[PDB]
A and B are shown apart, each in its own frame.
Chain A
Amino acid sequence: STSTSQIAVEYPIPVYRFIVSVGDEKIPFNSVSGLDISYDTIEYRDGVG
């Protein structure tokens, strides 16, 4: 019998309710996607291994 205050701190959050703020405006969008943080990798191998 979990309460509604344990759900708000343990249970994960769903995607279907979000607000977007473009600059100083609030525009209601339908689907925002494609934001990420990517890096490339540098390898260096030498001789003895």
Chain B
Amino acid sequence: YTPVVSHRFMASFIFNRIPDPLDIRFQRISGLSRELQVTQYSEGGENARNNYLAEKIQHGTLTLERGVMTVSPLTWMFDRVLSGEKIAYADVVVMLLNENSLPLSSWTLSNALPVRWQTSDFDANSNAILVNTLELRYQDMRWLGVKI
């Protein structure tokens, strides 16, 4: 039918089956890619058409940046795991939104491990928002709804 636009979205986190509804305001989210790795096997007298053998599926890496805000249960989670205290998992629910703020489709990203966390640079010469480019690696992705 008709396509949808890419500037309404919210992403909520699930810290140990306890939802996190304070941290849904993000600047951008990376867009979710998955890829089936493929080993090409060429053989014998068949030298006019390829022959591709499937392999394991390689999921992408989810980056999402936000303006730096007051400290929140999202920020206490990344600071806990990137200071070497506790390696813990967090589930991410990324959903599109309608005009009536209803979800079109949602991606649930099970057991996403927070990998890196990077702020923007200070500079005195230009005016811009300090952002928090924080990037986390998920190990499964289960698309759910209508209008994928």
B-binding residues in A (CB < 8 A): 45-47, 49
Main secondary structure of the interface of B (DSSP, over half): loop
- Interface assignment of B83: CB less than 8 Å from any CB of chain A: no
From A47, which residue of chain B is reached at the shortest CB distance? B124
Tell me, in angstroms, the Cα distance from A46 to B124 when the chains sit together: 5
Q: Verify if B6 is at the interface (C-beta below 8 Å from A).
A: no
Contacts of A49 in B (CB 8 A): 124
The interface bits of chain B over 114-130 (1 if a CB of A lies within 8 angstroms of the residue's CB, else 0) are: 00000000001100000
Closest Cβ of chain B to A18, distance in Å, is 46
Q: In the complex, what distance in Å separates the CA atom of A47 from the CA atom of B122?
A: 9
5 contacts between A and B (CB under 8 A): A45-B124, A45-B125, A46-B124, A47-B124, A49-B124
Which residues of B are found within 8 Å of A47, using beta-carbon distances? 124
B5: min CB distance to chain A, Å? 38
Bound Cα distance from A32 to B124, whole angstroms: 45
Which 5 A-B pairs rank lowest in CB-CB distance, beginning with the nearest?
A45-B124, A46-B124, A47-B124, A45-B125, A49-B124
Instruction: Name the interface residues of B20-61: CB closer than 8 Å to any CB of A.
Output: none
**Please, which residues of chain A bring their CB within 8 A of the CB of B124?**
45-47, 49
Give Cα A21 to B148, complex, Å. 81
Q: Which residues of A contact B125 (CB under 8 A)?
A: 45
Bound-state CA distance A45–B127 (Å) is: 12
A49 to B124, CA, bound (A): 8
